[PDB]
Amino acid sequence: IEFTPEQIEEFKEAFMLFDRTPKCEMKITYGQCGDVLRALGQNPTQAEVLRVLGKPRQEELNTKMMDFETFLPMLQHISKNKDTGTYEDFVEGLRVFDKEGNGTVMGAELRHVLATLGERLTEDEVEKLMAGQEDSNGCINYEAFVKHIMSS
Amino acid sequence: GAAAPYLRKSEKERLEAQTRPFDLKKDVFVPDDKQEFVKAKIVSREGGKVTAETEYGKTVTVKEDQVMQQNPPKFDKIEDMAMLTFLHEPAVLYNLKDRYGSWMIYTYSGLFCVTVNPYKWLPVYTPEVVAAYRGKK
Amino acid sequence: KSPGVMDNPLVMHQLRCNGVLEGIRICRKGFPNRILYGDFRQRYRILN
Secondary structure (H helix, E strand, C coil): CCCCHHHHHHHHHHHHHHCCCCCCCCCEECCCHHHHHHHHCCCCCHHHHHHCCCCCCCCCCCCCEECHHHHHHHHHHHCCCCCCCCCHHHHHHHHHHCCCCCCEEEHHHHHHHHHCCCCCCCHHHHHHHCCCCCCCCCEEEHHHHHHHHHHC | CCCCCECECCCCCCCCHHHHHHCCCCEEEEECCCCCEEEEEEEEEECCEEEECCCCCCCEEEEHHHCEECCCHHHCCCCCCCCCCCCCHHHHHHHHHHHHHCCCCCECCCCCCECCCCCCCCCCCCCCHHHHCCCCC | CCCCCCCHHHHHHHHHHCCHHHHHHHCCCCCCCCCCHHHHHHHHHHHC
16 A cells, blocks of 8 residues: 555645744654644544654653654554444444433533543533533433534 | 552552461450450360460460450451451451551541541641542542 | 550440441441442443
8 A cells, every 4th residue: 555646645735734843844743643643534542643653752742753754654554444433333332321211411421421531531621522502400412412523 | 459658558468478377277366455355276175165375375264155256367457347257346456456556547447437536747638649539540 | 635646445445336346247348439320331331
């Protein structure tokens, strides 16, 4: 496998954007390797990001810089992954909450699951995820929730 | 499970083999003034009456029913109480006295914990402790 | 009123007096952790 003329343009655009310098230099940080690939469309864990890091650095800013010559052999590798996820995994998953067959979810119980296990979201991102409107004591639903996530 | 620093007790406890050959099998708890309840051994049993010595070796004739059975050091200086097996008086008495002394005031005796007041501003209540403990596992 | 000091005669009596024995006889299985089952089910999901 190798990158097509359309794919090379996708990689070039995003990389050229990432070059943030008063005098430019054409490099990305190893930390920025995260959201780069994400904007490229590939959905990775931070585990997937660090896996392709030249330096055994973990999260920090100001370790290693990668050129496009280095970045492409990163991208070319990333494309191989198959397990990205569907909708119906998430439907099966989120149904487990149920107790009476309602597919309805209380707000507190819904915020807590986001925060606790995994790569995790913060208190702040939960405030963003739920800012209303006008349903008290105080329920969301699993169907409309997931479909909006996938919809973007 | 896995230990922490002094907030928990020394919960990375050992299993010192020395203690094992003792589980065989006729040792009991005798009443003392000094410590309270101590360790005695059944040497010879006169039916309803017994001849049980003590840590101090003094041989004494006793009446059956007083003899509380030994609850092995498999439950020495752990966090909770839960696992202490033979639940007669002295098995508990010894275990908490040495917990307080070992700097652990509060102790799990289930949900209804035991605390033996320290009376001293112990440096445990600092936001290092209160930074880690944020809906922790 | 002394810090760190303990007495045996007192504590002897007190552990016999706060129903600590019988108290451990039930509260040996008595769960000290207790949350909500809907959450724990939803939060564990795809482990299996």
